[PDB]
Design a protein around this ligand. Structure first.
Ligand SMILES: [K+]
Ligand SMILES: [K+]
Ligand SMILES: [K+]
Ligand SMILES: [K+]
Ligand SMILES: [K+]
Ligand SMILES: [K+]
Ligand SMILES: [Mg+2]
Ligand SMILES: [Mg+2]
Ligand SMILES: [Mg+2]
Ligand SMILES: [Mg+2]
Ligand SMILES: [Mg+2]
Lengths: 173, 214, 178, 153, 56
RNA sequence: GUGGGCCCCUCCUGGUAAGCAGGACGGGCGAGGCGGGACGAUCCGGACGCCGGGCCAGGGUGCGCCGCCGGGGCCGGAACGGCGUCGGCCG
């Protein structure tokens, strides 16, 4: 659901500051309102400019091409019930937004960390030789084969409507 | 009497004006978006951006009811004319009004509407306050008689004034009873729109929010 | 639910009608209410309101106060929605045109022997129902002895006398008397 | 509480400011007052005669009486459902001339001044509360790109 | 044997229910407490002003 | 008429503490129907004339019992212990 936005913003100009500086950031957000809110979060904490004292110049939205599978390495920090920690993750997805959905679901599941708990430092494409995690680099190889990891699911799904039958169906593998 | 003649002559002049203003207003409504497109393109050919105008009007919807409210909150809501849970109003934007509305964000959802939303609201749900009475808005006879002092004679004049936030915004706005909309669809009534809930500033998503309620 | 409490007040009750069992009063009221309805004329409006009052809000007027009030405008018609009494302390009465609900016998004789006129409100409603060259007048609504005791005698800013008989001195010889 | 003498609870408000002890400066007595003027009440803790109660510290009022030594001041005071108009007699060390209508007198003078000075069109003179800001252009030829940093602890 | 001593729980609401009243328009101009010498001078000046006097 | 109140949220005082006792802004029960929290005067929604249609808040959707599927992970209570399993940081 994540979408890619670039946000440009600045401090509101004064007499000591004719033409203040300009700051841009890449934001991964469900939509524009959350994206600008998160931009103001970061530019408040880092450049000491609250929403009240500045203006957003633009929120560009970028669409991305797919059709090929890439490696994304994501460097982040999250918060738990004992402190704050730094983390690296790698995923194989088609676009950066989808890679970031995969990351967020995996954090929600294995760390129980929510969206406003997490700050993204870096997101970058990682070459095949350049990979560093098993569950990713496994699939970065030629001729990868495996038998279907869960073929009972089809049979159960059909049974959901074929409630009664005249034999126990097989599970083709 | 002289009443039938004058009534008919007035109505005829109003109708001529109605067609005139309709076509001109459509022209203007078309031409703004090209203006800002060309401005953005001129910006982009340099290393420059275009920053457009900020919202001058909001549409404001109440989303929480009347049990348990605090005094300052209910005073602010009464002045906003938001007395019932699914009622909606138009509103002007300046520092006084914005600082009043931030106090009651958790009771409200608000944003900036399109000319299509304004048209749908007035044409589907238009009623008028006349001598304290709630009178249906069904023709242009009842807008000329009330708002002619302020140079608003037609439904399209009312729509245009409320969209551009013109010189008679106060009078045009207060001529309308608060809109009585159908019940809303919510995710989390107790959370802000920027946390996935539903109250607060929702930007240009107010149009989808009220489309199903109009 | 709707919030119709803040910024809104309790509605108000006033006399929209006289509660007299007198047919003359009821008929004059309906008639002048019709005239108001059909002409506007806040004169007829105020007269219609005044015919509904409660007889402590309709004090009397004396011929001497009327003569003083109508001096140097003697050509106008005085209109009084109450009784006109007499004042024996005024040796000579001038000529006036007065219209009133009731006249005393001595007042009628003095007015006529001066040379003026005694009109009724049906006379008024026939000759002139909207009050062109009439002057509405009334007496001192706070002339009653009852309204001289309202308040708290004993409080140091009252200026009001107590009600019964008080034969003592405690609190009755000024401040520093308690 | 259990005790409400006249100067109960006055340990800090009646104390004198740091390096501001001693006699008052003489503008306190060379100031000229008039009937109807606005004043603030501020208790100077070194002068004990004609010293108002603690409730009146930090309020604004109007002169009703000019006296030989003290001034008479009217204060609106809320009591339990109504407002009361209280009248007090205060010596000069505890009053200062108030500036609560300074801005209004400035604006009235400026309104008449610009009407006289009119440029042929008469400017809008009503105060206008801050509007939303207009459309404009900003260059972005020199953007700075920032990102969240790593936790350091 | 023992009951409650004090609260002001409902009192601000009771205070607001009829609105917060204002004192009368003429208490701002009451002569009471003004300088008697000033009040004397006032009476003399108006008493001798032919445009202001009400002597018969 | 009332001058025995009580509870919630935040802020406090005595006490080891208490469903203990004493205070504060705002709200509620008292004196508030209906739905939900299995069950409860006060919690979550919503506060009320008699009906017909529609939309839906709060909470939920195996059967009792009105209502569901798709996807990505994992598989009352203290100090202190665990080469259970999945994920990280530093060398
Ligand atoms: K008495
Ligand atoms: K007091
Ligand atoms: K103890
Ligand atoms: K009740
Ligand atoms: K109640
Ligand atoms: K573990
Ligand atoms: Mg309604
Ligand atoms: Mg009151
Ligand atoms: Mg108890
Ligand atoms: Mg139940
Ligand atoms: Mg079922």
């Amino acid at each position: 659901m994540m979408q890619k936005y670039i946000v440009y913003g600045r401090r509101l100009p004064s007499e000591k500051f004719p033409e203040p500086e300009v700051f841009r950031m890449t934001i991964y957000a469900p939509n524009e309102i959350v994206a600008k809110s998160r931009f103001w979060y970061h530019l408040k904490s880092l450049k000491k400019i609250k929403r009240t004292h500045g203006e957003i110049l633009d929120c560009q939205h970028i669409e991305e091409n797919g059709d090929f599978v890439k490696n994304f390495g994501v460097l982040l920090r999250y918060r738990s019930r004992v402190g704050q920690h730094n983390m690296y993750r790698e995923v194989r997805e088609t676009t950066s937004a989808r890679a970031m959905d995969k990351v967020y679901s995996e954090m929600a599941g294995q760390c129980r960390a929510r969206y406003h708990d997490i700050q993204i430092i870096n997101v970058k494409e990682v070459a095949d030789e350049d990979v560093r995690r098993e569950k990713v680099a496994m699939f970065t190889q030629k001729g990868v084969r495996f038998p279907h990891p869960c073929p009972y699911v089809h049979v159960k799904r059909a049974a959901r409507t074929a409630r009664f039958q005249d034999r126990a169906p097989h599970v083709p593998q | 009497a002289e009443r039938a003649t004058e009534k008919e002559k007035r109505a005829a002049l109003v109708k001529d004006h109605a067609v005139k203003s309709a076509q001109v207003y459509a022209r203007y409504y078309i031409d703004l978006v090209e203006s800002e497109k060309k401005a953005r393109e001129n910006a982009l050919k340099n290393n420059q951006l275009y920053v457009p105008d900020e919202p001058k009007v909001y549409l404001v919807v109440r989303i929480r009811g009347i049990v348990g409210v605090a005094p300052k909150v209910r005073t602010i809501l009464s002045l906003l004319r938001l007395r019932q849970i699914n009622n909606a109003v138009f509103m002007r934007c300046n520092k006084a009004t914005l600082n009043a509305l931030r106090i009651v964000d958790h009771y409200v959802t608000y944003g900036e509407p399109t000319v299509e939303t304004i048209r749908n609201l007035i044409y589907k749900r238009g009623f008028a306050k006349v001598n304290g009475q709630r009178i249906p808005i069904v023709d242009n006879n009842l807008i000329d008689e009330q708002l002619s002092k302020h140079n608003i004679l037609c439904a399209e004049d009312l729509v245009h004034e409320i969209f551009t936030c013109g010189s008679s915004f106060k009078e045009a706005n207060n001529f309308l009873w608060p809109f009585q909309l159908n019940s809303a669809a919510l995710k989390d009534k107790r959370n802000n729109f920027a946390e996935g809930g539903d109250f607060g500033y929702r930007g240009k998503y107010i149009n989808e929010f009220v489309a199903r309620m109009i | 639910g709707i919030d119709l409490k803040t910024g809104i007040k309790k509605r108000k009750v006033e006399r929209k009608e006289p509660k007299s069992p007198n047919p003359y009063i009821r008929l004059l009221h309906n008639a002048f209410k019709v005239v108001y309805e059909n002409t506007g004329e806040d004169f007829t409006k105020v007269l219609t309101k005044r015919l509904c009052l409660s007889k402590t809000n309709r004090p009397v007027l004396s011929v001497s106060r009327l003569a003083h009030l109508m001096h140097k405008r003697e050509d106008k018609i005085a209109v009084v929605a109450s009784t006109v009494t007499n004042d024996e302390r005024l040796v000579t009465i001038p000529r006036m045109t007065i219209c009133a609900l009731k006249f005393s016998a001595t007042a009628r004789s003095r007015i006529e022997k001066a040379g003026g006129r005694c009109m009724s409100f049906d006379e008024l409603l026939a000759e002139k129902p909207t009050g062109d060259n009439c002057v509405l007048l009334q007496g001192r609504r706070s002339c009653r002895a009852v309204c001289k005791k309202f308040g708290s005698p004993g409080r140091p800013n009252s200026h009001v006398k107590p009600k019964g008989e008080h034969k003592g001195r405690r609190g009755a010889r000024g401040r520093h008397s308690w | 509480t259990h005790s409400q003498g006249y100067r109960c609870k006055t340990r800090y408000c009646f104390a004198r400011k740091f390096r501001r002890h001693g006699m008052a400066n003489l503008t306190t007595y060379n100031r000229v007052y008039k009937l109807g003027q606005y004043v603030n009440i501020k208790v100077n803790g070194a002068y004990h005669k004609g010293m108002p109660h603690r409730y009146y510290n930090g309020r604004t009022g109007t002169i009703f009486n000019i006296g030989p030594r003290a001034l008479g001041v009217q204060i609106q005071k809320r009591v339990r459902g109504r407002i009361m108009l209280k009248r007090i007699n205060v010596r000069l060390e505890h009053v200062h001339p108030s500036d609560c209508r300074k801005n209004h007198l400035e604006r009235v003078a400026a309104n008449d001044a610009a009407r006289r000075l009119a440029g042929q069109p008469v400017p809008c003179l009503k105060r206008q509360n801050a509007l939303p800001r207009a459309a404009h252009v900003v260059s972005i030829a020199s953007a700075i790109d920032i990102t969240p940093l790593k936790y350091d602890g | 044997a023992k009951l409650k001593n004090h609260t002001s729980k409902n009192q601000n609401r009771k205070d607001h229910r009829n609105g917060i009243k204002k004192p009368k328009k003429s208490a701002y101009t009451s002569h009471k407490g003004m300088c008697p010498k000033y009040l004397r001078n006032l009476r003399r000046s108006r008493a001798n002003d032919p445009r202001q006097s009400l002597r018969p």
